[PDB]
Amino acid sequence: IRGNDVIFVLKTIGVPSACRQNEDPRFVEAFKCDELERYIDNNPECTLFESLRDEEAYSIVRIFMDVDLDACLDEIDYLTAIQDFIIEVSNCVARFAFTECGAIHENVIKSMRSNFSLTKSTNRDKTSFHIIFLDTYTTMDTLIAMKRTLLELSRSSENPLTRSIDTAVYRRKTTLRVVGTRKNPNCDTIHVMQPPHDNIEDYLFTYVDMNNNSYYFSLWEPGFISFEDAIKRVSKIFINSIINFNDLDENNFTTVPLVIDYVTPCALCKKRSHKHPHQLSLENGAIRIYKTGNPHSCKVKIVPLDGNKLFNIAQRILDTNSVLLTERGDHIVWINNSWKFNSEEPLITKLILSIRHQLPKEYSSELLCPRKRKTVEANIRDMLVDSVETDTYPDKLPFKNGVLDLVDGMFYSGDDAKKYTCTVSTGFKFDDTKFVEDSPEMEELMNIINDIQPLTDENKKNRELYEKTLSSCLCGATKGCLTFFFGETATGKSTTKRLLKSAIGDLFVETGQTILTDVLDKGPNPFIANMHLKRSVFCSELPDFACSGSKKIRSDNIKKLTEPCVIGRPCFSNKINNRNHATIIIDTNYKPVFDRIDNALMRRIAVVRFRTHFSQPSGREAAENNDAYDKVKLLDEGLDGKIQNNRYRFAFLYLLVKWYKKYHIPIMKLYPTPEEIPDFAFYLKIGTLLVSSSVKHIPLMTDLSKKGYILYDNVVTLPLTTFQQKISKYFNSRLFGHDIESFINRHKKFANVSDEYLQYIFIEDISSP
Amino acid sequence: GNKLFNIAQRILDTNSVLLTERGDHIVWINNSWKFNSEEPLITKLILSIRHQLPKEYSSELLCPRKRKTVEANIRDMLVDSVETDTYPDKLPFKNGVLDLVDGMFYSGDDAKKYTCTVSTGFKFDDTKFVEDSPEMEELMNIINDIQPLTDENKKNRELYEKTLSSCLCGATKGCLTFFFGETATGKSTTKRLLKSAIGDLFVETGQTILTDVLDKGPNPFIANMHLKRSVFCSELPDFACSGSKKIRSDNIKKLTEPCVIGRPCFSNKINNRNHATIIIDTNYKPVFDRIDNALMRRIAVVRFRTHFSQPSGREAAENNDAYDKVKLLDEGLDGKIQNNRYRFAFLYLLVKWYKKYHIPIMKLYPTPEEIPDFAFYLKIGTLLVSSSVKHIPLMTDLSKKGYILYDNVVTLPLTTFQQKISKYFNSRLFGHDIESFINRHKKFANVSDEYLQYIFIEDISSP
Amino acid sequence: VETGQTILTDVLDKGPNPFIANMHLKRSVFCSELPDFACSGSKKIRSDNIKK
Amino acid sequence: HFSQPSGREAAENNDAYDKVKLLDEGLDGKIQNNRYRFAFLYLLVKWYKKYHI
Amino acid sequence: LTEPCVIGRPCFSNKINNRNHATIIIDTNYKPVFDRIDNALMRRIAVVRFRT
Numbered sequence A: 001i002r003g004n005d006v007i008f009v010l011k012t013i014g015v016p017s018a019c020r021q022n023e024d025p026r027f028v029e030a031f032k033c034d035e036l037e038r039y040i041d042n043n044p045e046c047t048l049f050e051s052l053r054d055e056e057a058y059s060i061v062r063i064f065m066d067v068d069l070d071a072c073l074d075e076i077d078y079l080t081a082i083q084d085f086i087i088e089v090s091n092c093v094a095r096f097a098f099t100e101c102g103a104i105h106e107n108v109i110k111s112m113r114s115n116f117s118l119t120k121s122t123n124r125d126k127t128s129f130h131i132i133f134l135d136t137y138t139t140m141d142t143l144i145a146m147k148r149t150l151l152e153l154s155r156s157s158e159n160p161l162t163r164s165i166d167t168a169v170y171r172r173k174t175t176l177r178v179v180g181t182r183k184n185p186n187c188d189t190i191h192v193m194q195p196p197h198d199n200i201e202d203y204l205f206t207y208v209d210m211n212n213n214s215y216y217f218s219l220w221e222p223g224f225i226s227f228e229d230a231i232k233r234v235s236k237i238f239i240n241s242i243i244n245f246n247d248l249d250e251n252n253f254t255t256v257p258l259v260i261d262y263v264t265p266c267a268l269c270k271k272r273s274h275k276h277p278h279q280l281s282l283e284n285g286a287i288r289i290y291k292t293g294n295p296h297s298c299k300v301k302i303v304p305l306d307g308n309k310l311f312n313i314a315q316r317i318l319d320t321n322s323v324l325l326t327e328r329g330d331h332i333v334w335i336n337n338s339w340k341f342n343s344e345e346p347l348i349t350k351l352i353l354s355i356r357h358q359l360p361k362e363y364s365s366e367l368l369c370p371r372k373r374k375t376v377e378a379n380i381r382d383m384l385v386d387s388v389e390t391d392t393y394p395d396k397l398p399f400k401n402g403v404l405d406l407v408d409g410m411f412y413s414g415d416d417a418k419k420y421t422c423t424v425s426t427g428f429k430f431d432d433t434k435f436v437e438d439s440p441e442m443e444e445l446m447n448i449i450n451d452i453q454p455l456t457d458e459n460k461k462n463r464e465l466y467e468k469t470l471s472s473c474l475c476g477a478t479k480g481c482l483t484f485f486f487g488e489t490a491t492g493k494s495t496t497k498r499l500l501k502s503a504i505g506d507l508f509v510e511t512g513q514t515i516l517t518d519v520l521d522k523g524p525n526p527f528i529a530n531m532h533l534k535r536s537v538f539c540s541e542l543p544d545f546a547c548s549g550s551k552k553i554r555s556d557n558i559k560k561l562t563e564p565c566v567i568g569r570p571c572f573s574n575k576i577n578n579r580n581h582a583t584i585i586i587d588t589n590y591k592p593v594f595d596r597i598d599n600a601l602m603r604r605i606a607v608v609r610f611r612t613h614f615s616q617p618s619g620r621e622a623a624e625n626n627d628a629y630d631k632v633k634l635l636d637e638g639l640d641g642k643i644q645n646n647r648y649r650f651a652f653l654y655l656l657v658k659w660y661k662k663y664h665i666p667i668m669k670l671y672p673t674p675e676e677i678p679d680f681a682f683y684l685k686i687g688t689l690l691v692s693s694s695v696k697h698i699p700l701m702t703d704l705s706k707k708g709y710i711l712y713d714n715v716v717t718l719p720l721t722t723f724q725q726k727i728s729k730y731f732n733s734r735l736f737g738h739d740i741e742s743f744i745n746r747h748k749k750f751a752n753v754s755d756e757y758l759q760y761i762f763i764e765d766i767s768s769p
Numbered sequence B: 001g002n003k004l005f006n007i008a009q010r011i012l013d014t015n016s017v018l019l020t021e022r023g024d025h026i027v028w029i030n031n032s033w034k035f036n037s038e039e040p041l042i043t044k045l046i047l048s049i050r051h052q053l054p055k056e057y058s059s060e061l062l063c064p065r066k067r068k069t070v071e072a073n074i075r076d077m078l079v080d081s082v083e084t085d086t087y088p089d090k091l092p093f094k095n096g097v098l099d100l101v102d103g104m105f106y107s108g109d110d111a112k113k114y115t116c117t118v119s120t121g122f123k124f125d126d127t128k129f130v131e132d133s134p135e136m137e138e139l140m141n142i143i144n145d146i147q148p149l150t151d152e153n154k155k156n157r158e159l160y161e162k163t164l165s166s167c168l169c170g171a172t173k174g175c176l177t178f179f180f181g182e183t184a185t186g187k188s189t190t191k192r193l194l195k196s197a198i199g200d201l202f203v204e205t206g207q208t209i210l211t212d213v214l215d216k217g218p219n220p221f222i223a224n225m226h227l228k229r230s231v232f233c234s235e236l237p238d239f240a241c242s243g244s245k246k247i248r249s250d251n252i253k254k255l256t257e258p259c260v261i262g263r264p265c266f267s268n269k270i271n272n273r274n275h276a277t278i279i280i281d282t283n284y285k286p287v288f289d290r291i292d293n294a295l296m297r298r299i300a301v302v303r304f305r306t307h308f309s310q311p312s313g314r315e316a317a318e319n320n321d322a323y324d325k326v327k328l329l330d331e332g333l334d335g336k337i338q339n340n341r342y343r344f345a346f347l348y349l350l351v352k353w354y355k356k357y358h359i360p361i362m363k364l365y366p367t368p369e370e371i372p373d374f375a376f377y378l379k380i381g382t383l384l385v386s387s388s389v390k391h392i393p394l395m396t397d398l399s400k401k402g403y404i405l406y407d408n409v410v411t412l413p414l415t416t417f418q419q420k421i422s423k424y425f426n427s428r429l430f431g432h433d434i435e436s437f438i439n440r441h442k443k444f445a446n447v448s449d450e451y452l453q454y455i456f457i458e459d460i461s462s463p
Numbered sequence C: 001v002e003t004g005q006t007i008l009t010d011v012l013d014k015g016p017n018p019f020i021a022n023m024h025l026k027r028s029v030f031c032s033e034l035p036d037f038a039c040s041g042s043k044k045i046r047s048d049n050i051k052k
Numbered sequence D: 001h002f003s004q005p006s007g008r009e010a011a012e013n014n015d016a017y018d019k020v021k022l023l024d025e026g027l028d029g030k031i032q033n034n035r036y037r038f039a040f041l042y043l044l045v046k047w048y049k050k051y052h053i
Numbered sequence E: 001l002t003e004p005c006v007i008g009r010p011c012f013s014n015k016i017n018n019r020n021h022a023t024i025i026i027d028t029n030y031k032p033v034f035d036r037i038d039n040a041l042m043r044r045i046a047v048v049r050f051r052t
């Protein structure tokens, strides 16, 4: 809504609703930056509060909090406290935004932690301030919802600043004090600004200046603890007996000073003795222990009265969005700049141990006992209810140390890569130095590629399709066609398989022929179960069926593999569905033959040609005489070893990325080539030469009758003997009699005359006069 | 005392955990009965219902040991079992239940009463269940193209609507329907329309149970089709093959019972519930191993006429025998339907047809007139009549027509009966059927005489 | 309880047989849709199966 | 036989039947809802006493 | 069997992939007879003869 730049101000607290509606200038005002500054300057002792003029259109506000701690802290304690407070509050708000407002935890963290205005009250007995997050915007109903979780965080933390969060001022018509202005006419203390923020729009929670680095999102109690245990905790922290004992009741808790015999130095500040004795106060369900008189002689102490420490630790670990539950009931953790999941060995305890550095020291020491880490893991599993979607951005290449942007070539490492929840990684680290164009390895790889597929004019299209198929493996989406690497021996299909394996790493799996032969549903099929979020799978050495004795590759499997999802379950699992981002590549020396052929199969089969031979010098002319190759090149033997050494990995990766960039016109697809595999040629020629019967061709019987055709009940039918006599001049029986009878029975209708009749006419006959 | 026992009693009072007749538990978290046995959800539920508890009780549920103790108490207190989803007129969506009687959808505790485990797998939105939409108008045009509203295609349209709408009812269906067409006549179009519509309650498969023997087998499909409201059987392999297996009438009858007998893969369960509307889409004419009166009662046929042709193939496809209308293709139609745009509009259309055809029952009625061999089998009965007492007094007067008398019963010799019937059907096509009828209704008394207790209707009619 | 036709057609001992195993202490057993012998090559009911 | 009123005459001439009645469309649902459970149980017990002296 | 990776897992162990560092030798009294003969298979078979 482009925000607002007018500041609405009330003067006196408790102004009437009638006065607010009438907008009487005696109390109601509206200014801009310069007008506000001039008003504050000219009128020094005027009260100034900020509110919302409209809750129906300008509900957009910033993220703000109020903290007031009734104690004095020195500089170092103040700095560590504010650091911990910022981290905890930003994590809590980001987790709430992610889990309720549908926002993104990482941009929320970035916007809240980039900059903030932090004032300081001129009063010296206490530490109070307002904090404004400039670049985070949301509606007021969002704060309405945030109230509960912010109160829970306030109640469940030891930090004085976080514990002293004012959970009010999150209501309707909420009014915030204006900086530099007294709250009461009879008081003098005010709030003053702190560097590097010096202007006045930096401290107003309604002023909106949305820019690039911005983000917006939208949608003694008897139950605390036994009093004896509370006093026991106080004494146990004191580490010394108390002179005034058995006289402090529940009623005189906040009145009677406490006196300590200084046998051991006061553990709060290690000082040998204190002039004035120590006293207790009850704030927000915690006992604050302080010393009267000197504000810096003793460090203030916090004793909680409720909650569970190992539950607070688990909540703090959970609200960093580093453990998540997927739609398949598996827990993914963010360790070492990657998303990892392992059903065999859960990694939650590893995450708990590793994440202790991003937690306050009080919670840090508890995460060293394996028993307590197991307790925290048990808490986390119970809190993780509901699931989240993963791997939804098909433009990113996930490396073990980050994410490479395919549309740009920019590498994101660390938290920047955390947004893209890519749960499968190549397994190795990206390297920008080795991801360069000019390199001797690059020239060697270009030589190899041009050797395997020449750039000749005849080969041009096949080489381009080679590039297309190799590039589309990088796509994280689902493609609608398979690729067959058909070629003769010693031609480089296994070499390019090894090249892709080295280039893609763990985003690559090799499976057997069971996928192409057996039923995919069946029972336990870990081969199908291994294609989860893969991008390149390989089936090698398809057992071709030139001789009878083996079940042919079934069409059902190849139709099912094209689907965006695949139905299949592993051993001892309940999930039945896995996403199909993988490109299915099968290596064979022979033409595959499918059991059932129909129309749809001409939209799924793309094959790649290999016509280059690498041979020993002895078989030079022996290979040259063969027509299986169009060129013979000498064979290099250490090339396999150096490829196994992953020497060409980054060169081939750069080449693939450039191919993807070139081929990636907005959205990309794959197209079959149903003219190379020979078993489809039968049906192609039959379709281009034979068509079914017709009813709209009824006023065209003259030429058919002149040729010799007969008419019956408006359906063209002819005997089988003359069908064979007519077809004997196009197809030979000794060639494909099995296929001939196959389609004959497929289209048999029987009836008519005294023999079977079929609904078929010849395209050549109707084409001829 | 025993705060933990009190907590367990309080939780069990809300009926959030149930024990089903499979020796397993179902829990209600996130407004859905998510049965899970591999990993229990009871501790998750215990931690979830924590703020609906007194403050002196909420603090004890933060310890995993105490949560496990409460779960053990609940497991010991359950004891009894309940029945799973029994309401047929309730469609369960991932976030509630939709009553088809008033088309009203409700979630929360109001949807807890209908203990439905199976679900569509996708959420339901209130603001897209509307009559007016670009999706609505485009879908209406598509259906009006596929099934024209002309008075010739009236009963076919009614059958299409009824069978399509029956996929929502959670009862058992007594008929198997056929989608008959020639080539690309919207078959897979309406199949993928249903897949987009319901989802996770529709199973697409080819042959298997339709072709093989159901019993004496480890076949998984029979267990797969448990509590699924729609099942499609496609790509039937042209049983007019002379070498390929036929269709079993016993298989058809097994598929048309409230309970289906099957042995999934490795377990010992042998019975499963049948709710699916089994739809079989074929181009070639199906042929059964053995047809009879009982089989003819369980088959319905829906014919597909209007076809779509590309601009280039328009002249090629504009002349077809079984075509009735020619229209144009659409390259982005399949991707667009996979974009789930027509989902809720087609749900509303299915609900409307369901309300139309429940008055107040939607029993599926067989249509045997479409199948020509069924027509031959029934015309044999219409052109004949079994011998009865009314034919006894005739005797000699009817025997003058070319018949004889056997035990005061009008009888015809087998050879003369064959000569008489040979002038109606085609011998080449119906020789096996004639042999089948002869061996199915034969009567013998001695070495020579062979009796048939049937008389032609035209012989009786003619003076 | 309801069971398939294998009870009358196939070998009772063989390997596993939950169809037979489920008849423990059941007061009534039903089998439906007898496989008409009108199809050549069909199986036959076993007299020893009846006796067992 | 229990038939619809259209094919009633077509199936009457069959010798496999001695009687023909009108098919009832509510029997399946009424049985599925366990309406006749205790009535059939009472008849079964009466027949048991009759035929097991 | 000549590829650098093989698939198979032990009992009570979720480890599937195995490396292929092996020289595969088969000692026989008879020459092997293969179902399919092609130019590719000829690149993977060698025979040593024992004649004492």
Ligand SMILES: Nc1ncnc2c1ncn2[C@@H]1O[C@H](COP(=O)(O)OP(=O)(O)NP(=O)(O)O)[C@@H](O)[C@H]1O
Pocket: A447, A448, A449, A451, A452, A487, A488, A489, A490, A491, A492, A493, A494, A495, A496, A589, A614, A634, A635, A636, A637, A639, A640, E040, E041, E043
């Ligand atoms: N550009 C190249 N320059 C030199 N040697 C090469 C080149 N490309 C491949 N080779 C080598 O030539 C041989 C070809 O073997 P291979 O890669 O297995 O082909 P192939 O078609 O997969 N053999 P096969 O699986 O039996 O059909 C290997 O030793 C490669 O290292």
Ligand SMILES: Nc1ncnc2c1ncn2[C@@H]1O[C@H](COP(=O)(O)OP(=O)(O)NP(=O)(O)O)[C@@H](O)[C@H]1O
Pocket: A599, B141, B142, B145, B146, B183, B184, B185, B186, B187, B188, B189, B190, B234, B235, B308, B328, B329, B330, B333, B334
């Ligand atoms: N109303 C329409 N307008 C334009 N194109 C349409 C329309 N309806 C269908 N089509 C197209 O025509 C095709 C018809 O094919 P369809 O009948 O659904 O599959 P099919 O070929 O019969 N499957 P199968 O029977 O196994 O061969 C659809 O896939 C669409 O591409």
Ligand SMILES: [Mg+2]
Pocket: A493, A494
């Ligand atoms: Mg190879």
Ligand SMILES: [Zn+2]
Pocket: A266, A267, A268, A269, A270, A271, A274, A297, A298, A299
């Ligand atoms: Zn001290």
